[PDB]
Amino acid sequence: GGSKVTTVVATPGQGPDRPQEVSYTDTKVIGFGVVYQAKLCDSGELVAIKKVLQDKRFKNRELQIMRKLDHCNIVRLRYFFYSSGKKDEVYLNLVLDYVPETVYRVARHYSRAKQTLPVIYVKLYMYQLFRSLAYIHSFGICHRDIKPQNLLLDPDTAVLKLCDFGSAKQLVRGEPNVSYICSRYYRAPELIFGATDYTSSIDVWSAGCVLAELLLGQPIFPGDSGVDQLVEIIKVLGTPTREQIREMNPNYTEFKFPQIKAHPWTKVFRPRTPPEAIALCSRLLEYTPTARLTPLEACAHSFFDELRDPNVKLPNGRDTPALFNFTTQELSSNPPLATILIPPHAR
């Protein structure tokens, strides 16, 4: 509680379900559930506690996803436990690692100063994001809410962690999913068209929007609504062809859309933007979902070559965070890419 100590029987987020007593203190409300910050008594480490109503007749979707995951670029589920409310009401409590900053907050610092994030950080943040996406996608899990607000950031170590799996779902080919998902600025165009048979490549579109935003200093597609979101995309990429539209949603064959020319892609970004950043962005923000890079292919992109330099260091004089501890799971979509991904000095 506030300055009381609360002791609960909680299950560790990894391994078998053997609950044990866990104590925490210093609860403070941060913000469809409720989110608290707390301190674990045994270690003093700060945690976030997400508390949501949970019906006993089914298992929490977010919890079942979180328990599968163990990756340095994904927020850790330390524990989970259940608590009470209204007659027979039960809350699920997800005890997550607490990280003080996000990419949203850090990038907003540079915007208000009218400045741009130095590209070394763009490389570091996007690389770790793509690693987290390769990892979750290897399980069939789509995050469905990739945006700067869901990218935890430790500014001292430059470690990035993907968080807020409340929208995430295991996508199964042949089973429909909801189309009004993802935050609007980062929503893939096939979702805007109302596709229900989409794939994990919607996360790659969202990541491309994040990369563009970090390069630009503001969201690249600031739509006023679902339809205006697509208009904003079209103002940059031009009208999708009839073919690209069919690849996004095959239900628009009786319609011919006005032809808008694409903006010159280099003129979208500031003059000195690295060409490899622009090239990577163009391979993420593709209308045709199957044309987008996979997360693992994105990690191998030339834009991240600086991160594989043996002499690379953070601007604060510290070593780079873990970048090359790839697992078989993470590499499973294209294992030979490890020849690029793991440099000789990292073996």
Partner: peptide, 17 residues
């Protein structure tokens, strides 16, 4: 349902053409 969305999109694109 596509018919409603497409008609809206066509008008918004004509306003920028």
């Amino acid at each position: 349902e596509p018919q409603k969305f497409a008609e809206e999109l066509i008008h918004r694109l004509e306003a920028v053409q």
